[PDB]
């Protein structure tokens, strides 16, 4: 048997409406549209605290190949994750329970090695297809790519990397598809654990004095945490990305075209093609 990983963050979900009524959008669509094969089995991961378990649990016995659930626990998770990634909670978060926000970053060390690719995915998000059809993404990293993700639809990050953008005007940092780099979104991640544990490159840049080093160098300070990481280290290595196709992942929030880039927005937010995941951020609907 083949086995498939994907991890959902289900933290506060106690009493609260609109965090299921998306998460009844996004685990709906996605088991009535989910096809594997006989010997395959799908494992679906949540992370939650005792209060949210329940919540999950009574959800997915109304919407359910075989497929297993396992869930984690967030102070479990949290404990670990916490020696790792202290040092960029700083930078990207800009104390001590804000470490869960980082999981992706080093999923590859929080994971049994028994487990070599997993996808993390949001909960405002809505399924167009099968899910097995992103498991072959995975096939297209290049050697020496970690991580499979979707670019930012959103001109966030002119406004992030505004003071390395001022002192270089001709830098691609920032700028918009197809020529420039706009930075990532974390909505979709498909994470190459095997590859992780391997790379030396993707090892130093998790250590303390290279995020250091790279934040200064683009006067970095952020507070959308593991996005905020990937998107910086994109800039200095964006091999290490494989960037995932716009339809994986469309992004529906407009609030910048909104509140300041009503000129260059449309840049970053076209996206031709049939849409294989929708992404409901800032609360957008669908």
């Known amino acids: ?56 649990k009574a959800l997915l016995r109304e919407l359910l190949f075989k497929c297993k ?28 329970s804000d470490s869960i926000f980082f999981l992706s970053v080093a999923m590859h060390q929080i994971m049994p090695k028994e487990i070599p690719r997993i996808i993390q995915l949001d909960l405002d998000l809505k399924y167009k297809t099968n899910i097995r059809e992103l498991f072959e993404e995975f096939d297209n990293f290049l050697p020496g790519a970690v991580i499979g993700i979707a670019r930012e639809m959103q001109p966030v990050y002119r406004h992030t990397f505004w003071q390395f953008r001022h002192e270089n005007p001709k830098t691609r940092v920032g700028d918009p598809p197809p020529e420039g780099l706009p930075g990532f979104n974390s909505g979709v991640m498909l994470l190459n654990l095997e590859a992780m ?28 945490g593991d996005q905020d990481f990937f998107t910086m280290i994109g800039m200095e290595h964006p091999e290490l990305f494989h960037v995932l196709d716009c339809t994986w992942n469309r992004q529906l929030c407009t609030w910048w075209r909104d509140h300041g880039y009503s000129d260059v927005f449309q840049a970053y937010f076209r996206c031709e093609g049939h849409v294989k995941i929708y992404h409901g951020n800032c609360n957008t609907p669908i």
Do not use: C
């Open 1 to 56: 048997p083949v086995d498939y990983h994907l991890l959902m963050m289900f933290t506060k979900a106690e009493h609260n409406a609109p965090l299921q009524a998306k998460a009844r959008v996004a685990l709906s669509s996605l088991l009535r549209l989910a096809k594997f094969e006989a010997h395959e089995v799908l494992n679906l991961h949540f992370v939650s605290e005792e209060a949210s378990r329940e919540v999950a």
């Open 197 to 224: 544990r391997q790379s030396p490159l993707y090892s130093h840049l998790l250590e303390p004095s290279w995020v250091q080093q790279l934040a200064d160098k683009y006067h970095f300070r952020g507070h959308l």
């Open 69 to 96: 659930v396992i869930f984690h626990d967030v102070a479990v998770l949290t404990d670990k994750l916490f020696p790792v990634v202290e040092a960029m909670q700083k930078y990207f978060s800009a104390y001590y």
